[PDB]
Amino acid sequence: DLRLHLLLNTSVTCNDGSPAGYYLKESRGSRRWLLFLEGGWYCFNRENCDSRYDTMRRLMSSRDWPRTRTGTGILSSQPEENPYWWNANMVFIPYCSSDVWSGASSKSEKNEYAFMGALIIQEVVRELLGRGLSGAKVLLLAGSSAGGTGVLLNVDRVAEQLEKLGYPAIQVRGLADSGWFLDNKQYRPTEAIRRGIRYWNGVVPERCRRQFQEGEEWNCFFGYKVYPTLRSPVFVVQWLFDEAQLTVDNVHVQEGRLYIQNLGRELRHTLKDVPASFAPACLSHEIIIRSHWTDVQVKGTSLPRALHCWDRSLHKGCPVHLVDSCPWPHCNPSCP
Ligand SMILES: CC(=O)Nc1ccc(OCC(=O)O)cc1
Ligand SMILES: *[C@@H]1O[C@H](CO)[C@@H](O)[C@H](O)[C@H]1NC(C)=O
């Protein structure tokens, strides 16, 4: 169980102005820290955010959050469920900003909702420094789906924050799960991201802005465009046939088969120069906080093993780049 703490800086809020927070379980003898970003799509104008407020309020408000959550998958403390980092200090940061973790805008007389996802991450880091983070050796920023994209948008800023606060000895790394999307042609979203960025006052990593410049920052929400610009190590976990990708492609089998196969091949191609990556040929969504995340294997190697191999490589038979080459979903027998 991770215990809830609401942010002491009450100017950092969820969408409706209620305070944001984080769930924590410390591990007294460990210098490793895992900060996980929850997913759950986004909203991009008032009408669309109003609908989300009626039926997905826990992703917009803390007023109904429970006092504890159970850690599962990579957030488990049991070595059988989590061979990789079971002894780590565990943090679960709920998603209540609906901005793919990019926003820096307070609720005010001109704004019905607050979009502060980028500021929420920074404030969590600040408040953890007085709870043991100041003696850390590694901080792994992880996240799933919209939280996976949020890792890519925020990992370099966390490292920059700790450097300027005087902690250059903490190694910041990222783990992006199911947040690596393509801006491809539909079978029958870029505009939604572009409009949300303006609604949210969203921010993107600095080198990626300087390349694409004003009006085009929406490009930095796509992994294969922002990843080459990042300075911190980032491991990428991504199903070749991600369910959210097929949704934004209007896919829900006759020859026009070719579309799904072309999607698998293109996502394969974008990962060719990503040295640390795990990409099975499955139709599914998220993996790292699910209880049976140890079951999936790529070419004989499990995901917890690959993450351990990544750890050693940052210090034979322990690979870190694992991408399936079969071109149809569920061709890998270990798919969920
Ligand atoms: C261009 C675009 O639409 N990108 C995108 C898609 C889905 C997202 O979230 C899915 C989830 O959180 O399940 C977040 C961002
Ligand atoms: C509280 O958070 C806001 C937004 O990030 C920041 O401007 C302000 O300086 C913070 N206050 C304190 C006391 O940390």
Side-chain angles (χ1 to χ4, degrees), residues 94-108 111-136 138-163 165-184 186-193 196-197 199-208:
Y95 181 43
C96 63
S97 52
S98 312
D99 55 3
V100 183
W101 296 95
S102 83
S105 177
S106 297
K107 187 182 188 343
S108 75
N111 300 325
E112 178 71 9
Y113 297 100
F115 300 99
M116 311 186 66
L119 299 176
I120 290 167
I121 294 161
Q122 301 276 111
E123 182 68 33
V124 168
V125 168
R126 284 161 164 190
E127 299 190 14
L128 290 175
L129 286 167
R131 285 179 176 268
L133 179 62
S134 57
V138 177
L139 190 165
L140 179 55
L141 182 67
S144 296
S145 323
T149 308
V151 164
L152 297 168
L153 295 174
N154 288 281
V155 66
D156 284 354
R157 188 171 299 113
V158 175
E160 181 178 57
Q161 180 191 0
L162 291 173
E163 283 170 23
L165 288 179
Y167 298 100
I170 302 175
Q171 308 178 47
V172 177
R173 305 162 188 175
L175 171 54
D177 173 24
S178 294
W180 186 277
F181 308 99
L182 302 183
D183 51 345
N184 62 344
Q186 284 170 331
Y187 177 66
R188 292 191 178 98
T190 56
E191 192 47 51
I193 295 292
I197 294 146
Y199 197 53
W200 304 333
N201 195 37
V203 308
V204 302
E206 183 176 31
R207 193 177 290 170
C208 191

Side-chain angles (χ1 to χ4, degrees), residues 159-163 165-184 186-193 196-197 199-213 215-264 266-310:
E160 181 178 57
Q161 180 191 0
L162 291 173
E163 283 170 23
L165 288 179
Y167 298 100
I170 302 175
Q171 308 178 47
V172 177
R173 305 162 188 175
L175 171 54
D177 173 24
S178 294
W180 186 277
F181 308 99
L182 302 183
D183 51 345
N184 62 344
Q186 284 170 331
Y187 177 66
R188 292 191 178 98
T190 56
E191 192 47 51
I193 295 292
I197 294 146
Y199 197 53
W200 304 333
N201 195 37
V203 308
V204 302
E206 183 176 31
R207 193 177 290 170
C208 191
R209 262 178 316 250
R210 285 171 177 167
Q211 290 175 5
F212 294 98
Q213 294 180 333
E216 299 290 333
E217 280 98 356
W218 64 266
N219 282 279
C220 298
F221 286 57
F222 292 79
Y224 77 97
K225 300 184 189 186
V226 63
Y227 175 93
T229 81
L230 301 182
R231 304 146 271 280
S232 314
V234 176
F235 183 78
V236 175
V237 177
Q238 183 64 44
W239 308 114
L240 289 184
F241 308 101
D242 185 88
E243 265 170 44
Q245 180 77 53
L246 291 176
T247 295
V248 302
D249 283 330
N250 282 306
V251 180
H252 302 287
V253 174
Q254 296 178 358
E255 181 191 16
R257 170 180 67 84
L258 292 163
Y259 184 97
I260 295 173
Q261 282 175 336
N262 287 143
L263 172 68
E266 283 173 2
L267 190 152
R268 190 169 143 70
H269 182 263
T270 62
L271 295 175
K272 295 310 226 313
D273 304 332
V274 177
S277 73
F278 191 85
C282 309
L283 173 57
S284 191
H285 182 64
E286 301 182 356
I287 192 49
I288 60 171
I289 54 162
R290 298 209 263 201
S291 285
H292 296 94
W293 76 284
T294 61
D295 284 8
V296 75
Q297 288 177 6
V298 171
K299 294 181 175 67
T301 298
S302 85
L303 175 51
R305 173 160 184 74
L307 291 167
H308 156 74
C309 300
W310 183 49

Side-chain angles (χ1 to χ4, degrees), residues 46-62 64-66 68-108 111-117:
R46 184 177 174 89
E47 285 296 82
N48 178 252
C49 292
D50 286 347
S51 184
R52 185 180 172 87
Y53 198 74
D54 296 327
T55 67
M56 311 175 86
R57 187 162 292 176
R58 281 168 295 167
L59 302 176
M60 299 189 66
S61 172
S62 61
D64 297 329
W65 287 352
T68 71
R69 297 185 46 111
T70 299
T72 61
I74 200 171
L75 289 167
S76 182
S77 298
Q78 283 184 337
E80 292 90 359
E81 176 163 345
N82 183 2
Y84 173 53
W85 267 24
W86 58 270
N87 206 19
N89 299 286
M90 302 298 181
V91 178
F92 177 98
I93 311 181
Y95 181 43
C96 63
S97 52
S98 312
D99 55 3
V100 183
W101 296 95
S102 83
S105 177
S106 297
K107 187 182 188 343
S108 75
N111 300 325
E112 178 71 9
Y113 297 100
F115 300 99
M116 311 186 66

